[PDB]
């Protein structure tokens with residue numbers, strides 16, 4: 001029963017305070033739709049391809065609507081919320097229904113091109129587990145940005161080889177998802 | 181959604197594990213007489229159980245039973261076993277719905293009381309549960325005395341615990 005993602009090691013020291021201060025003032029510049037460019041293995045992503053994450057800010061926290069096709073083959077719509085941590089930590093917590101929240105640091109983002117997401121937890125006895133992501137603003141991401149992220153994760157020692165381009169494209173029923 | 185409600189501040193305590201843990205001597209019926217209220221446990225009174233020792237498995241096939249806080253009689257059926265990574269007194273709980281969780285035997289005399297700690301640290305908060313198991317269904321017996329000591333000396337305030345009621349109503353079938 002111990003999950004496969006619960007592994008030996010510590011989370012990395014990211015400077016969350018700095019990020020949090022650069023980031024809090026421009027939280028509306030984050031709403032919008034973000035396509036998932038690639039993510040390190042993550043059992044909580046029940047959407048395999050065409051991952052279109054649409055964030056809607058309301059002043060305090062965002063309300064997510066996520067769409068694409070399941071692993072099963074079907075069209076899937078998943079609801080979530082990304083609000084600021086509630087124990088006052090400098091990062092927000094992401095929380096999709098039919099799930100317990102997780103922390104989620106926006107490692108680097110330019111609000112209109114890519115956003116690198118990192119989310120890690122330390123446990124006792126030396127274990128931990130991290131989940132990373134890359135968000136693009138447009139289905140296909142300019143491999144000039146994919147390199148600014150890869151550069152960022154290499155600073156907090158995430159094995160880049162771990163990501164896996166999800167599949168975004170012409171194929172994708174975006175137009176269908178936009179209706180749910 | 182949210183953070184489970186039982187998470188609290190602070191990391192898990194770093195308690196000691198019983199020195200030479202003998203699964204085989206630990207088998208049998210054990211009654212829960214004081215517990216830190218634990219959400220994954222439906223039964224709340226007359227809590228009693230049987231730890232059946234297997235030896236090709238080198239683990240226990242535990243069955244627990246008792247009453248609801250409402251009044252049905254429930255019966256849970258999990259597995260609990262030592263593991264490759266740590267000394268046998270630090271076992272793992274493999275019950276159906278519940279998270280794999282640890283079962284640390286802080287101290288036991290096998291014949292009388294067993295003090296079990298179980299807590300997963302999360303970052304700087306914890307989800308901490310503990311037990312005071314006795315071989316007698318006496319809630320004021322020698323177990324509590326003994327075990328509340330152990331827990332305090334290990335960092336788990338005994339005040340955190342509540343007593344499991346064992347009265348006239350009890351039916352120990354497990």
Ligand SMILES: CC1=C(/C=C/C(C)=C/C=C/C(C)=C/C=C/C=C(C)/C=C/C=C(C)/C=C/C2=C(C)C(=O)[C@@H](O)CC2(C)C)C(C)(C)C[C@H](O)C1=O
Pocket residue numbers: 085086087089092093094100101102103104121182183184187218220221222229244245256258273275278279281282298299300302303304305307308309
């Ligand atoms: C968002 C967020 C966080 C969120 C943290 C979460 C969401 C933690 C969730 C923890 C869980 C869910 C722990 C469960 C942890 C669960 C645990 C430890 C369960 C132990 C269970 C035991 C011991 C059961 C024993 C049994 C016995 C003995 C019997 O006999 C049977 O009858 C009954 C039976 C239940 C089978 C944060 C806090 C990191 C802080 C970050 O800054 C942040 O931003």
Ligand SMILES: CC1=C(/C=C/C(C)=C/C=C/C(C)=C/C=C/C=C(C)/C=C/C=C(C)/C=C/C2=C(C)C(=O)[C@@H](O)CC2(C)C)C(C)(C)C[C@H](O)C1=O
Pocket residue numbers: 001002003006042044045046047051053066080094096102103104117119120121123124125127129130131133271272279280281282283300301
């Ligand atoms: C028993 C035991 C241990 C047990 C430890 C356990 C049992 C840990 C369980 C951990 C869990 C269960 C962690 C989950 C940890 C889960 C975490 C961290 C989840 C993060 C999720 C994120 C970031 C999701 C992001 C998304 C984005 C960004 C989107 O866009 C959406 O479309 C998709 C979506 C997936 C919703 C021990 C290690 C202490 C060792 C002891 O010796 C011991 O004896």
Ligand SMILES: CCCCCCCCCCCC
Pocket residue numbers: 099100101102279300
């Ligand atoms: C499978 C349930 C997912 C819960 C995701 C939030 C983090 C859970 C930590 C659980 C630690 C035991």
